[PDB]
């Protein structure tokens, strides 16, 4: 388990995040005074950067 854990480096983290996070679909569940929480398109757009 320790070998598997410390076999994770920065490049591995980037590759896994690009596999799971970059431009994927989020699922939001909210309750309460959420009248100021941004809508779905906001999060879906925030899942990627246009600078890079």
């Amino acid at each position: 388990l320790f070998a598997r854990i410390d076999a994770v480096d920065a490049s591995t983290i980037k590759r896994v995040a690009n596999r799971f996070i970059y431009d994927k679909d989020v699922a939001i569940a909210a309750m309460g005074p959420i009248q100021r929480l941004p809508d779905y398109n906001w999060f879906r757009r925030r899942t990627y950067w246009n600078r890079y």
Binding site: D25, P33, Q35, D39, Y40, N41, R44
Partner: protein, 70 residues
């Protein structure tokens, strides 16, 4: 200028999980039925005066042309 919360529950779907341009031509005959049935009064009021005035003007012009044409 404040927001008035309503206590709703809203289910929404991703824009990439549902087709986009099919709803334009889906159920077209009923759409045209609505557009014509709920608006024929308005079209009559908008166009009737115009076509009536045009017909009156053409009638008057032709009658004067014949009368004055010796």
């Amino acid at each position: 200028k404040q927001i008035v919360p309503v206590k709703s529950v809203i289910y929404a779907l991703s824009p990439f999980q549902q087709k986009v341009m099919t709803g334009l031509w889906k159920d077209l005959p009923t759409k045209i039925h609505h557009k014509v049935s709920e608006n024929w009064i308005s079209a009559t009021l908008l166009l009737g005066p115009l076509v009536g005035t045009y017909a009156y003007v053409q009638n008057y012009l032709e009658k004067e042309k014949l009368h004055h044409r010796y």
